[model samples]
Target chain A: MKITSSNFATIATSENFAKLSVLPKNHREPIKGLFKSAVEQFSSARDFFKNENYSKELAEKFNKEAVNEAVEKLQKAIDLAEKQGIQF
Target chain B: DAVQKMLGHCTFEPAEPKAAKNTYTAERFIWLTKLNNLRILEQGSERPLTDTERATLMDEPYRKSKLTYAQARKLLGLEDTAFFKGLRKDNAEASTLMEMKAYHAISRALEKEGLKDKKSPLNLSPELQDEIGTAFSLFKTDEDITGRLKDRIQPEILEALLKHISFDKFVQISLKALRRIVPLMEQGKRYDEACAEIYG
Candidate 1:
């Protein structure tokens, strides 16, 4: 749950994903893959933040869609998995 | 085998307490990852493995039909020399895992589709009966299964095994079997002797 920047790369096998408990006996892997992909993007973003690699102009023009899409997909999966069991 | 180092693949050992139940062995890790990989690869396309549905995942002709252990190793191209020693070790570990995995698959499927409570002359769906019949067929001659240590699966255990088969019950019984057999299977017999001891 606390998959912060420093911990993102290490999260894949860390049992952090188990927090998605009652997350359906199925559907665990996509959340994991998306987490891996999203974390890679975030790690890259952090490196970029610490030391400017591309241009500031490129930053202003940069697309946030990739990371945004990854997050949304992961969130939606978690929601659907929970909703399958408990509704309120 | 030469193409990928153990480092070349994704491998992990998580904290023991947090790992899946009964999956405390290297073979378990191999299976956990292998199935996890399968799930990730198939995520957008399918659900879980079923008989006909599962067959489609086999890309190799040998596997598409029936792959032998020797053929599988030949395809992997690992030589006996030390140069590929690590790969050999990895393959050996995975071979154990594969056997373990197949046992689980067959057992679980049997529980789900085959076994049922008896009611004089048995009233089961024809299709379910066919599936169940097919599941029983696996035991008759599958090289993977052995005669029990007591010489064959104990009458009571066998009866209990199929007496009230349900997915949960099957999983429960097979988990106990896996726990019993895993260590002995890994020790030297490539799981055959242990399996023979357990299920024959």
Candidate 2:
């Protein structure tokens, strides 16, 4: 599958994250795990912003952490996709 | 086998659609004012304040000129173009209203969870309250301060909330506090109660 197609499929199946264990390849497992981790990190950041504390310094800190985690996850996923012969 | 399978059929049914109801309240006007103020503040002009204008905001009454919704919007450069064009899209008003409603809900929820006290002062320190109050007042008269409401609020408390809350919830809380606290500050109710209900 192409990278974009694989990403869409992964996202669609993410509601059942545990099902990722059924996938055969070790590379695909990391890709799925990365996607799930990124989503959770972003969700935590969103929740943090909603509480209305309004400390810009704290906000920047959380944002940076979440973004960094997301970037790392995306990079891992992309690498796995490339290894799987997926192109986007 | 195909002919036997064709003997089984499915039926379709359509359900009646429900009519939507329109709701209006004072909150709508408040939101409109905020939206307009954002627009004006975004578009700056050199105009002198009339005596009436200055007098109207002098005492910081509820219906004062310190910062209308328009002025606040303009200050934030919340114009209907480019980055802000999406402000009014996709039932945005209703979404904004719902967000405000949720803030009220969460505030109650926090109280129930023992995460926060409904009646307690928002800030623990009286000294902090005094400092914030003075800064808030200075923001009213100083154009420079007005221009930096995003930064001021962001650094003091809003950013902290953002760390714990959602964006929608933060916006909702901010709006609710603005509606209640701005007037209360003008009334010299700047200490504990006002900060508790709004500024906190």
Clashing pairs in 1: B146-B200, B147-B200, B148-B200
Candidate 2, superposed: residue stretches over 4 Å from native: A1-23, A50-56, B1-164, B167-200
**lDDT accuracy of residue B24 in candidate 1:** 24
DockQ of each: 0.01, 0.12
Candidate 2 chain B: minimum summed lDDT over ten consecutive residues — where? B1-10
Q: Model 1: per-residue lDDT, tens digit, A1-88?
A: 3332222223333244555554544665655566455544432331221124655335423323433443454455445545554321
What lDDT score is found at residue A7 in candidate 2? Answer: 35
Chain A structural similarity (TM-score) per candidate? Answer: 0.47, 0.58
Whole-model alpha-carbon lDDT for candidate 2? 0.36
lDDT of 2 by residue, A1-88 (tens): 3222123223322233444445567765777777666545533444444445555466556655664565566556656665665543
- Let me know the TM-score candidate 2 reaches against the reference structure: 0.28
